[model samples]
Target: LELRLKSPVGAEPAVYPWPLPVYDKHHDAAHEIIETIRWVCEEIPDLKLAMENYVLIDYDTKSFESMQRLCDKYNRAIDSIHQLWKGTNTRPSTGLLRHILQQVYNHSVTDPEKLNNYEPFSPEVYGETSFDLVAQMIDEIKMTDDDLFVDLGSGVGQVVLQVAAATNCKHHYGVEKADIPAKYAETMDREFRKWMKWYGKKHAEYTLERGDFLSEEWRERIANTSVIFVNNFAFGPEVDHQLKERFANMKEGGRIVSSKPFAPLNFRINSRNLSDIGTIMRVVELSPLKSWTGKPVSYYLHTIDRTILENYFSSLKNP
Candidate 1:
């Protein structure tokens, strides 16, 4: 009981055990892998030209010799393309990254029911920031090798994994409090590492831990992190306030990217509003940002800057 999938671009044939693992109630791994390869080829023009239009799957077949020949041909084609890619040193395309993530999720999150079994609008509720939004964030925030990245409330560690793959950040961390998603995060970590190796791709060091971002341990960790990402779209006022308190502890110039602004965009630092988070940070709204909800969401980028408060105090003293 085996499944053999012929590659369109003459890559090695993908072999799977009979009765492929269920990704969700509706999808299986074999179909997902085929679609992934197809979509990856569609994104790269050269790979598209080298591929065949039709997918060929040989399930439980005795024709090993012909399959071997076809696989050999595809492997040579893929090797040439790999050589070309090596020369360019280009990062993995969004399409390819999406494929890798999809595969990782499919393998790791076998029970989608657990993910969807949360109360609506609750802090424990799960939602994902889409891949494209993350890609935009990666481009907008140019991370150096010295930077440390963290994703607060990271669901299944998708954003952390993508950022780790795309950026040169020294380390990436994802913290989740929910039981189900946090448990799945462990599996996602292993799958991401395995698949990245299978594809010969490199990713920055990353850890997906099961813990509360608001915990005492994370307070110092958050303060030290260079870049922080949080999908706080449905968070309550108390959690938001607590997060702001944590943000207050951050080092100057540390950046926080969130689905909701932690501070007022037009915050004026007067004597009355000196304690506001905005007085110590700069919040800028980024439009056309999106998430899994399919709505056009606006994200905020907050930079920790004590200069704003310092200048405000100086003005008051001089006046």
Candidate 2:
């Protein structure tokens, strides 16, 4: 900490967590980062805190060279954190370890049969989307706090929670069909809320539903949703057709990121209203990203185009 301050680096010490693998898993390091920021904010004068994906060190310095050096030192610290783990097989200063240890202890104390209660509730096996990829998707969609975001079949609600945290959207919705995962999503949200309180930060309101998306009264939520994320892993053609129909009726100008393109083959329906869906929703293929199985996975970015829909309807009336 002394060396960090002694450098030509300015009044504020900057810290960036993600895109660096070691710090990415070190959730507990926030304790230090927060403490440092609090110290700087209280002790330092004529400077305010600043943040982007990374924290900007003492913007008051107003020197490009100093900024560059501080950035370099921050990045080196990230690299060294990862290196220390590799060298010593020690993961110090990680929140993930602390969380995991507590969870393990709880599970160990629980009755084995009680823990197995949700075993049958599993349908889609657990999968986690890479945080880096989700961060990119948020940027790609231009997510804003004003918009509502929904995740269909949200497994344990990780993606939804991350999106809520990152974007701080006013409203975030998630639905999980499986019973166990749905409950787990609720649990995760509860713990996350506690974490935010401990950090003294505020974020979006989270809503998680445990039921089949189709059966639930989610149309109200869906209508207001600006972006929807669907993993679409285990469903079949019938479910695909159902989803296509449901999405076709959604509010215009919304964006959806999905495992399958909601256009091309799926939206080729004969009815004029249905046929318009294919033309109304534009699909852009996402660059190949690895799936949970480490297999090549393709995503489609779909934006609902109301102009195209209006044109199609207008042409029918004129014809």
Candidate 3:
């Protein structure tokens, strides 16, 4: 069996084996490759204008040379755009970043079953934030080269890898306590590096290590990080409490992004609630967000601000 991708520019069709290789239970490699090519061309106007359009079908009968040439044509187009990007040192477009991320995940996590082999799948069970959500966070957070970024409970380090590739943060870190995901994270690290280099693209420095974000060592690390991302949708109340304590230690102006708000958005600074996490940080619900669960979710952005408390205290004195 075979699949042929027809190009509208009178170029030879690209061919691939049928029964497309599965990337995971949810995805197939062939469709993903086709989508990447189409999406990349869509993002680059010149490429889109030059290529015109492309279609895929189950029809067969294409020579290897023709397929290779078709692929090479697309590759050369992408390569020239990448070269221009390198010269300008600009971040990749969302579509391009998605392509790179999909490629990295496909290559690294070869066996998705291993991620879910454990019984009694719980909230701590691995889940992905998806490329679109991460891209939105990147645009909203706006990390600079002077900043340090960390993804707490980073399963397979996908968020960290995406952020590193899209931002100029001084360093990016992913800390995961789970054994299975941590092991895959190592492979992901290597694969990400290899792919980025292969594409002649650059990413910020990043590290994926097996560690508990709630540990004493992370207390200091979390406090100092300029931007922190945590998917706490499934976290328990106790863990949320502990996270609040850590958030209290963050310096003023520090930012945290989470699927659930650590503090109430309407929290008011009063003597009774002065010690609450909401007092030291401002939490605002971000626009509707989506994740791997295929459900619409909400994310919260928290910024550390001690002035809320200070103003309350000052008001008492002045009054």
For all candidates in order, the CA lDDT equals: 0.75, 0.55, 0.74
Give per-residue CA lDDT, model 3, range 1-319, as digits (tens).
5555433233344455645567654667655656756765765687765542443232121344544444556666655554666797345566677676777777678777778744322222223435656677787889999999999998888889889988999999999999988998998898787656544467899999999999999999999998999988888999999999998999999999988889888998887887799888889887644234444646789999999888888999999
Candidate numbers, best lDDT first, in rank order = 1, 3, 2
Expressed as tens digits, the lDDT of each residue in 187-270 for candidate 1 is 999988876765557788999999989999999999999999998888999999999999999999999998888998989887
- Estimate the overall C-alpha local distance difference test score of candidate 2: 0.55
Candidate 2 clash total?
A: 1
How many residue pairs clash in all the candidates, one count each? 3, 1, 0
Q: Best by TM-score, which number?
A: 1
Off by over 4 Å in 1: 4-15, 22-26, 36-90, 117-129, 289-294
Which candidate number has the best lDDT?
Answer: 1
Off by over 4 Å in 3: 1-20, 24-26, 32-90, 117-129, 288-295
Query: How high is the lDDT of residue 60 in model 3?
Result: 22
Cα RMSD to native, each candidate?
Answer: 5.3, 13.6, 6.4
Number of the candidate with higher TM-score, 2 or 3: 3
